[PDB]
Write a protein that holds these residues in place. Sequence first.
Motif, PDB file in Angstrom:
ATOM      1  N   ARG A 299      40.102   1.910  54.479  1.00  0.00           N
ATOM      2  CA  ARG A 299      41.296   2.696  54.225  1.00  0.00           C
ATOM      3  C   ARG A 299      41.203   3.540  52.967  1.00  0.00           C
ATOM      4  O   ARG A 299      41.619   4.696  52.959  1.00  0.00           O
ATOM      5  N   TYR A 300      40.632   2.982  51.910  1.00  0.00           N
ATOM      6  CA  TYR A 300      40.559   3.732  50.672  1.00  0.00           C
ATOM      7  C   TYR A 300      39.473   4.792  50.738  1.00  0.00           C
ATOM      8  O   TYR A 300      38.292   4.488  50.900  1.00  0.00           O
ATOM      9  N   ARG A 301      39.910   6.039  50.587  1.00  0.00           N
ATOM     10  CA  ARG A 301      39.048   7.215  50.594  1.00  0.00           C
ATOM     11  C   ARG A 301      39.875   8.401  50.120  1.00  0.00           C
ATOM     12  O   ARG A 301      39.392   9.256  49.375  1.00  0.00           O
ATOM     13  N   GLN A 302      41.131   8.443  50.562  1.00  0.00           N
ATOM     14  CA  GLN A 302      42.053   9.501  50.177  1.00  0.00           C
ATOM     15  C   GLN A 302      42.305   9.425  48.684  1.00  0.00           C
ATOM     16  O   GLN A 302      42.337  10.441  47.988  1.00  0.00           O
ATOM     17  N   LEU A 303      42.483   8.200  48.195  1.00  0.00           N
ATOM     18  CA  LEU A 303      42.715   7.970  46.779  1.00  0.00           C
ATOM     19  C   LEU A 303      41.491   8.405  45.996  1.00  0.00           C
ATOM     20  O   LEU A 303      41.602   9.057  44.961  1.00  0.00           O
TER      21      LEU A 303
ATOM     22  N   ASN B   3      41.325  12.111  45.914  1.00  0.00           N
ATOM     23  CA  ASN B   3      42.321  12.585  44.969  1.00  0.00           C
ATOM     24  C   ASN B   3      41.863  12.334  43.540  1.00  0.00           C
ATOM     25  O   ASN B   3      42.030  13.175  42.659  1.00  0.00           O
TER      26      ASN B   3
END
Lengths: 32, 56, 270, 106, 43, 446, 111, 419, 33, 55, 55
Positions: free
Chosen positions: E8-12, E15
């Motif tokens: 799930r973590y990739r957008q963060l 950013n």
Amino acid sequence: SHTDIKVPDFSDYRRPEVLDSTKSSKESSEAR
Amino acid sequence: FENRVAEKQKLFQEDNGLPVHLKGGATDNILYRVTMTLCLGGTLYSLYCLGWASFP
Amino acid sequence: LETWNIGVILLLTVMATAFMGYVLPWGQMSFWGATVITNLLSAIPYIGTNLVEWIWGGFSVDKATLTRFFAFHFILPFIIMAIAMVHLLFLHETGSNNPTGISSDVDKIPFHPYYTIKDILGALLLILALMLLVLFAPDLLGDPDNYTPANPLNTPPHIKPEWYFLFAYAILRSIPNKLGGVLALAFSILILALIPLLHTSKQRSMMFRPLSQCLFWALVADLLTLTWIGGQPVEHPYITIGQLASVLYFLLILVLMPTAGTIENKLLKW
Amino acid sequence: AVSASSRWLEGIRKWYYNAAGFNKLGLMRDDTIHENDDVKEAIRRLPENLYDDRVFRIKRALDLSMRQQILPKEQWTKYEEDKSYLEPYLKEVIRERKEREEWAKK
Amino acid sequence: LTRFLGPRYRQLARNWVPTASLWGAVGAVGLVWATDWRLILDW
Amino acid sequence: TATYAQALQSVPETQVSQLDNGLRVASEQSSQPTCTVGVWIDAGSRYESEKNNGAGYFVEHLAFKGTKNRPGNALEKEVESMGAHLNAYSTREHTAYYIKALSKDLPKAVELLADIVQNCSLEDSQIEKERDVILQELQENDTSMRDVVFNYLHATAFQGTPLAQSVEGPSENVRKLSRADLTEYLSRHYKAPRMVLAAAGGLEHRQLLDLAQKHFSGLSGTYDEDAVPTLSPCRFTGSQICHREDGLPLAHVAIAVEGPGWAHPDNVALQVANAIIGHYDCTYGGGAHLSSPLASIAATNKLCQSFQTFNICYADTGLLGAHFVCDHMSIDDMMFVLQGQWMRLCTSATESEVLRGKNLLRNALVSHLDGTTPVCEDIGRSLLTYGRRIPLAEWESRIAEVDARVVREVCSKYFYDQCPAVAGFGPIEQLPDYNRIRSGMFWLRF
Amino acid sequence: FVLQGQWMRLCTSATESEVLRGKNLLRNALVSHLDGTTPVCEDIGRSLLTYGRRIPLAEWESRIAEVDARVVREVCSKYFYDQCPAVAGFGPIEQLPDYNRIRSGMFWLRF
Amino acid sequence: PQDLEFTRLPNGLVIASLENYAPASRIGLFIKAGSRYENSNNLGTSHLLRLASSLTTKGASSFKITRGIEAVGGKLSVTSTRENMAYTVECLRDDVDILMEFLLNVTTAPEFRRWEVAALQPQLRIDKAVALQNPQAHVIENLHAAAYRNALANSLYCPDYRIGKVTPVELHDYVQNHFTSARMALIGLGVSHPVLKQVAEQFLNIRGGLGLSGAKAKYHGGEIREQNGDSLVHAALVAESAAIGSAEANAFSVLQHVLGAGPHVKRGSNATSSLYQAVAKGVHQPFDVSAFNASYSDSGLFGFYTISQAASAGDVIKAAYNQVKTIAQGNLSNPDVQAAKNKLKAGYLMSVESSEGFLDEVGSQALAAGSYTPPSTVLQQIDAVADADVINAAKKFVSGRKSMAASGNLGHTPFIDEL
Amino acid sequence: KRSVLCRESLRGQAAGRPLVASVSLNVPASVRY
Amino acid sequence: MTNIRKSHPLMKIVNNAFIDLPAPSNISSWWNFGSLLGICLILQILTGLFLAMHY
Amino acid sequence: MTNIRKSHPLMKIVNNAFIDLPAPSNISSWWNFGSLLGICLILQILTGLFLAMHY
Ligand code: HEM
Ligand code: HEM
């Protein structure tokens, strides 16, 4: 009480973009 | 072992309007930008070297 | 963890203090010791060199450096006291662990009644040692006999830090390469903050785990072994020894203990 | 394929416990664990009997430690009696939290 | 360690790189004034 | 067998139809017993001038107390003996009167409604009887922090605009209000096209269109001029109004950032956003395990009593934010988590999280539509709001385009670097300083 | 803290006022108990095994009368000052003072 | 398109289904445990049970449960009645399966863990406090414990003294005895019956007879009076209604409506409500009065409810009585019964005009009768009531053991002997 | 607490099948008749 | 509270980390090194300041 | 609380005497001398330590 209370006129205090009574602040608000 | 191609098929068939090279998540995106960055920079660096070598 | 990280800072701050004070008297040991340590910073590739020269306030260690150490020696301890109190602050939020390794909340005692006398008693023995040393054998523990005013061309072929810093000097020696030695010197000390993460057992108390009690002691005796090397000619005999002690130390801390933890946990069926 | 080795290990385990302080102390092996956030919740999950027990045990234990006295040979914790009473409770707490992570992850 | 890693973590992270990327640029600017590379000055 | 999507497409479409004057007819058929016929007029509070600020709301007390045809209690008696219910609701943009009734009762239903809208026998006695009542309602609304605060919000984010006035209106405009003034009000704003006659259930559209009779058509230029005054933008203002009363047991806080009109692609994506933060109460069964952080934190740390995010949608204005009730000592912590949830949302949304909110949306937006009354209000209001479309099956599509990056970019327009509208009815002693709430909308740290 | 405090103050700082009020309280306590038949009977019975065969009733007032603020101060300091307490609780006793604390409360350095 | 489809199994659990058109499906397992199933020693247990729906269970941890439904935007609502306990479950067409498996764990696999149940406890107070904010709840509760002696006199909220004392074996026991096959009725608003059954068959087969709690009914006139400091006073006056789904009952309902004052108009006053008229005339300006009508399996409660101010309490209270006496004296004209009727009929239809409404109606019927009575039929029954019949029923309130409950400043509230 | 001064409040209980039905849900919660 | 010296001054309360604090029973002699640690810090300082009074 | 940086570290809470603390509204410019007083102590200190680096 709450109904009776109303905001003091902020025209002098208020910025020129939001100064107008009948028009949008969104297309004037961002610059300020 | 595992066998979960079924999960991935679903993940990649998902109608999110994403191009296959991004359909897989956030890492796809960072990989993409890294690759793109290195290429453009490299290309810039190469042009500099040629301008430099053109002269005596 | 938070208390551990302050400790670590504490430890290292004192470490700086001790290194500069010993140089204040400006005697042959001090003079050289500063050069060779400071210069050991010039290992860094890009900066190093420039940076060693800034720290010294010139190309060598003349007046410029000597007054700097005087000022930082003076002001570190005050800064450190703030740290200590900050350290205490954090520790006050979870109280003191025990030999058993279990919470004691079910057994708690007045600090005033009991631990004020203990502490005073502790003092009494502490002072004892400090005056025993200071009154009977003033120089004994102060290896360095160099009461000789520093002559910049002269050199005690046997250059070495004091007992506190003896371990650090030894760590640098086992690595051929300069830079490799500085990294490994830092890692000696700086490896402390890892141990939290290394912890592998279910019993925070080593007390119930033989095997770590054995490798704990060995590290301590490896640490003693290293201290010995520190005052040793840098020759074959000592080299080869130090090198295996420096690997032993990092094994004990990085690899052995952590495994032992696990094992013990598995023998207890935990 | 563990028949001889594991058998030695079983014998070794008793020695390990014997080697371990908790058996000598008389306190249970489960009680000895580093009180962290998971242990903590397990702890809280204990019945009055189990749980008050762990309080007396540690009381009796920290008392001994304070006096540097060992318990009599007759009254010691025997390895064969490994109440892993926290284990059950402690497992789940972890189990819950590992999941939590899975749900949070995806 | 393992817990932190996630699909799930990739957008963060993406950013973070921009903010991180922006932050990285500031240091070069900050270092450069102190560093005073003749080449940096030449730039 | 049948699957969500399928069901979706299978839903009875809404038929929009028009009379000669602009009377809008809509209806959704099911051939079921009960019916909820309604007339959704769209002349609200925002058309009122400072005097008639509470005009409309006053008419609503008279709506059901007589028609020249049906005098004193002839309306109620009629509804009652049928077993039909009659409700009147008024908004800052929309007045609406509807009837719930056996499907066979349309005949006298639709007659009644129609009657109601047009002829309202209003004597001096009824005017002076309503006044007293209104003045007493006002007093009772001051007894509600949530209502006191949300008004405030509007007034401060609308300071200097017609839109910022209470729908209940000014105390003394009720006293003063000339009997002649309700007329002009009605006459100028009840003229369709404004109005829509909507309905759902067991009826046949054909008949609703055929059945509907228009008493009069407001061709009027004044009717147009009256409309003309309406639809002007209302200046957006980020100010706070803090009314501290340590006497009160809890604290109500309504914090807002101005938003899109009724129609906008950004306006569904927002919703999906608030799906995520969610809403919470002392009595939620999930508490600590609820998947929205503000809820979990709240649940966990006894942070708040109840909290809800909202999206208030007006033609030229929109109020966005949440609202939390919380002990005197927890005002700041809940502010912190909330705002925190906003920022995290426009920089770190994850596809998982936006996909869960997404689906929440669908449900919220399907389940609402269960029942006759519901459908009717969607059809009526939908027509003055979004015009004459019924975006119901589209929704799933539009809701479907939702992406974690879409949600992120849309949320950042409205919340990020924007200046809040905050009002509270203390214990506000611990309520964050306006500048603190301000800097809450950008990310340096915290 | 307050109680022990009271003790100490008592044997160092008693004021005639204060003692005189307690004095009088005693009288009353000692007179009013003796109201009724049962009460008188117990005093008479128990008095005889306790104090032997006297009934110090009228004496009291006399004895009570000899009370002085110095008398009360010297008499209290025999029994409470520097003397080791007998303390029992039935917890929440988690905050109950450490035996040594209680002990040091019976002498006056500070507090 | 397809109408419902009941099916009683060998266990005796009912199940229905209606593949609707629209996007939203809602299951709801109604178990027959109401508040009436607890004893002196077990009071407050359903309450806690109701609040403990999201706790860990055998196949799903409190975290997965909650986070899971959130994942998909689902809602899980438990409805508790003095007689029944509806466990509702809404979600999107596609996600029923993920949701159903949740409903099944919650209900057949609860694991009340000492630690989990314990942290809930305090929630009971918070819940009780928020529902005791409406006078209606404490009065209406006071009413039921006065009017009954044993079973239905038990309240829905846990008694203050019991709160923390609710033990995990209690919860486990209550589920075990009451959450059983014979007392259950599945109900789907957008699911396949064929697939519903299969599931029902696989997961809802548990044994447990009725009344291991102590089932039985009984009515006892009594008065519970709660003094306050509030201007307003609420009181309820009620006599044994007729029982559930029987003619007498039905009659009551119609009568109820002839006096029944639930406004059908915003800001509007009833012209129709006799009670209101009569009360009104003898009463002051500000006052509120409404008829009350409750019906359960083995007893009912019919009568009215008043909201008067301090000094007006009696005047209103008697006024209302006197008027209902009128109907009992015989005075009631045909024109008003037909209005009533139509009022009722319209209401019942609007009641069922929504998914949620329908689903309740259906399950409800499955626990009483054993099948679904269609609306029409329903409508017929209510119509069969005779104009006399109504009077006759009414005759029964005036000549039936009184039982009242009031709150507020009770200087001016009639007692039993007062009226 | 909501003020109950005027002719507006009629609240009284009596429904068809359900009577005094209390519902508790995570999403929502209430008291009806 | 009244005339409880300790919590009267707020400052003097902060010093009750020494007197009133929960300290475990059992506790090897090893922990005295914390305290001594401070002891040494204070001794060096007093000593330093006098030496730096003639250095 | 969870992830409220401020109260998480106990140490960081101690620093919220700067950020969250109740401050009077009305307040002459005179008050700015407290803060300024402390800027002066810090200034003097850094300066001193560099001067005493070559004195
Ligand atoms: C300036 C040097 C230091 C001083 C004056 C000091 C002082 C103290 C004192 C007085 C105690 C309480 C008693 C005890 O447990 O021994 C303590 C505890 C502690 N110190 Fe230090 N310390 C210093 C350095 C350090 C260092 C370098 C670290 C670690 C990097 C550290 C970490 C700790 C920890 C973790 C504890 C708590 C242990 C426990 O009881 O569970 N200390 N310190
Ligand atoms: C724990 C912190 C400190 C440590 C480890 C420390 C250690 C030392 C050492 C090892 C020496 C060399 C003495 C010799 O062998 O001749 C020294 C000298 C000196 N130190 Fe300290 N010191 C500390 C704190 C201070 C402080 C706080 C001051 C001033 C307030 C100070 C002032 C001096 C002076 C003036 C000398 C030079 C004269 C001499 O050799 O005695 N030191 N220090």
